Amino acid sequence: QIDYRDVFIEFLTTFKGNNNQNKYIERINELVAYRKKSLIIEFSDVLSFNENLAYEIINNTKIILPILEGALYDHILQLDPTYQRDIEKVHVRIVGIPRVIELRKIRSTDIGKLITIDGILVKVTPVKERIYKATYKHIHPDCMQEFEWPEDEEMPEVLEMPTICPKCGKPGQFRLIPEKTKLIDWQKAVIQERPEEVPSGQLPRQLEIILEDDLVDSARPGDRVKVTGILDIKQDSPVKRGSRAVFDIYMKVSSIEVSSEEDEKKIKDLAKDPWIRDRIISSIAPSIYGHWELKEALALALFGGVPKVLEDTRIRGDIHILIIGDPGTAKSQMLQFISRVAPRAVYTTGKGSTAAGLTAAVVREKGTGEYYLEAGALVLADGGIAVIDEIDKMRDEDRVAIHEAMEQQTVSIAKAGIVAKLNARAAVIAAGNPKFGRYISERPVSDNINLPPTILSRFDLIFILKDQPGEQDRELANYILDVHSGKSTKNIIDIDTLRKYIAYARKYVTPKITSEAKNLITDFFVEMRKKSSETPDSPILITPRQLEALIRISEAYAKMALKAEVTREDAERAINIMRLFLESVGVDM
């Protein structure tokens, strides 16, 4: 009854934020400056301003939304006439709806209402074009007339062809005219419920969502997203008569969120502590006793180095870690922790993986007999971390796919007439067991791990974990029993804060190596080479590839402390950890 365009338009112009900044008028600025055509409004903000407007949006969404959009378009038109003849429609998207429903609990009562669903994006289709207003021509020697068939409304999800010519009243043949047809961008994606919500003994459920207009290509597969929109039943084969009055539901997306100022302030405060590096290492797997050297290396892989593009070649910034340990050394517990704290990580197992599943799988569209690719584990981990457990138990045919990923950071696909090269810039963390149960110290690493030597050289660091009973058993027993009793360590950064810290560092920090750091690295290398030249009788090689590892590790240390330069201390720490690896593989100074 009461028009809400009046209260809405002044709400945009008059609203004060946390720091008294008038965000919405600032947000509306680049909408006309950069021609966004889409606006984002928080539900809490509109609720505090006027609850009557807020509750009308949730309930009567299908009616108030077109009215609100028209008011905003007029506001932009008077503010900048140049928007005309450029963008003819502006979308306003509402986020933060309190009505959040689990994927498994959707029932018929929620159809046609604005709801929010949290899940994981698993599938994305290429962008396509959908007709919303067609133009046909009547093929009848008398007629030769053109008209817009879905008059006075929009073309439904099912393409319907006119049967009677509206301009002559006769049936016959109608020809589509693509020149005068109105199109709109259209994309389809599949969302899956999070593994924490799946009930015992059940399999995860999936829901189909539709992204249109500017919402296309707003997310990548494997991302955790929050999506808001309207549910509706799906019609796909109306001509398929015969039983089956049962339909599936699909979601019509109106707004999507992936995964901000106070957090940035909180991150900066943490970096001010001189011992921030020690705190971060102590926060890696707090439930595991000992393994300080391994924890330090795992922290470095989370941050990584800085990739370098030379005149001809490319230098990867990712760090690869290989862990060999006796059974029961808590190898899998840390890998589970790493996959949970990293902003983007994929956890795989040697036995549960295949070559097609790791890189890309060809799917034949039975409906049209068409071939298209599906992203594999390594591709989904691009820009993140790939964790592989029990690498020694993987099939040899499935292991060769990893060889290209670690070396060239690329995956080559040539099958079913599809040729492409895919980026796989991901850090690889692998764990394995020795050949004969426990580890034999006297024998070299190569004959004690059951892996080809060609893959050993591709790892920046290798660690050996030995479960030798001794005087530390009492401390380990006391620590474990405390964990089972609920006792937790203090001064530990929680997972959520730690994940945000890593994401910020990987995005805004690019350390640069100073001259002093370069001299120390060069001096250590040449003196090591001279020492190694006397007797290079070790299974672990000392090739110049180790020099790149030293560069990467030093950059990671600087990035951990949010430093813009690599100083003497960072280079010294990188040498120490590199020296331990060069001597813990069974070869002495």
Partner DNA sequence: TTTTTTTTTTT
Residue 243 Cβ, how far from DNA at the closest point, in Å?
30
- Among the listed ranges 141-149, 320-328, 385-393, 578-586, the one in contact with Zn ion (CB under 5 A) is 141-149
Distance CA 516, CA 507 (A): 26
Q: Give the Å distances, CA to CA, from 518 to 447, 555, 574.
A: 36, 12, 12
Q: Following DSSP, what letter does each residue of 444-461 receive, concatenated?
A: -SHHHHT--HHHHTT-SE
Q: Binds 362, which of Zn ion, DNA, a second copy, none (CB < 5 to 8 A, cut-off by type)?
A: DNA
Residue 122 Cβ, how far from a second copy at the closest point, in Å?
6
Q: Is 566 left (phi over 0), alpha (psi -120 to 50) or beta?
A: beta
Q: Give, as ranges, the residues between 303 and 362 that touch Mg ion (CB under 5 A).
A: 331-332
Q: Pick between residue 249 and residue 355 the one whose CB is nearest to DNA.
A: 355
Q: Binds 416, which of a second copy, DNA, Mg ion, none (CB < 5 to 8 A, cut-off by type)?
A: DNA
Contacts of 441 (CB under 8 A, 6+ apart): 466, 586
351, 311 Cβ separation under 8 angstroms: no
Distance CA 255, CA 264 (A): 25
Q: Pick between residue 169 and residue 369 the one whose CB is nearest to Zn ion.
A: 169
Q: Which residues bind a second copy (CB under 8 A)?
A: 104, 106-108, 111-112, 122-123, 127, 129, 139-141, 156, 158, 160, 163-164, 166, 169, 172-173, 175, 178-179, 183-185, 192, 195, 217, 417, 419-423
* Integer Rg of the chain from CA: 30
Place of tokens 């393994």: 291
Residue 38 Cβ, how far from a second copy at the closest point, in Å?
13
Any known ligand binding at 329? Answer: yes
Q: Pick between residue 364 and residue 568 the one whose CB is nearest to DNA.
A: 364
Residue 374 CA, distance from chain mean position? 16
Residue 424 Cβ, how far from DNA at the closest point, in Å?
16
Residue 172 Cβ, how far from Zn ion at the closest point, in Å?
7
Contacts of 400 (CB under 8 A, 6+ apart): 355
Q: Binds 138, which of Zn ion, a second copy, DNA, none (CB < 5 to 8 A, cut-off by type)?
A: Zn ion
* Residue 143 within binding range of Zn ion, rule CB under 5 A: yes
37, 91, 138, 425: residue in contact with Zn ion (rule CB under 5 A): 138
256, 211 Cβ separation under 8 angstroms: yes
Which of 39, 38, 35, 7 shows the shortest CA–CA distance to 23?
39
Contacts of 194 (CB under 8 A, 6+ apart): 118, 119, 120, 224
HEC string for 355-417:
HHHHHEEEEEECCCCEEEEEECHHHHCCCCEEEEECHHHCCHHHHHHHHHHHHHCEEEEEECC
Q: Binds 168, which of Zn ion, DNA, Mg ion, none (CB < 5 to 8 A, cut-off by type)?
A: Zn ion
Distance CA 576, CA 406 (A): 24
Any known ligand binding at 274? Answer: no
Burial class (CB in 10 A: 0-12, 13-18, 19+), 223: middle
Residue 138 Cβ, how far from Zn ion at the closest point, in Å?
3
Residue 222 Cβ, how far from a second copy at the closest point, in Å?
19
Q: Which residues bind DNA (CB under 7 A)?
A: 354-357, 360-362, 364, 415-416
Q: Pick between residue 104 and residue 395 the one whose CB is nearest to DNA.
A: 395
Q: Pick between residue 327 and residue 352 the one whose CB is nearest to DNA.
A: 352
Residue 150 Cβ, how far from a second copy at the closest point, in Å?
11
Q: Binds 332, which of Mg ion, a second copy, DNA, none (CB < 5 to 8 A, cut-off by type)?
A: Mg ion
Q: Give, as ranges, the residues between 101 and 160 that touch Mg ion (CB under 5 A).
A: none
Residue 471 CB: number of other CB atoms within 10 A? 6
Q: Pick between residue 155 and residue 355 the one whose CB is nearest to DNA.
A: 355
Place of tokens 């949970």: 340
Q: Binds 175, which of Zn ion, a second copy, Mg ion, none (CB < 5 to 8 A, cut-off by type)?
A: a second copy
| Binding site listing | 325-332
Residues found near Zn ion in the complex (CB under 5 A)? 138, 143, 165, 168
Binding-site residues for ATP? 325-332
Chain contacts with Mg ion (rule: CB under 5 A): 331-332
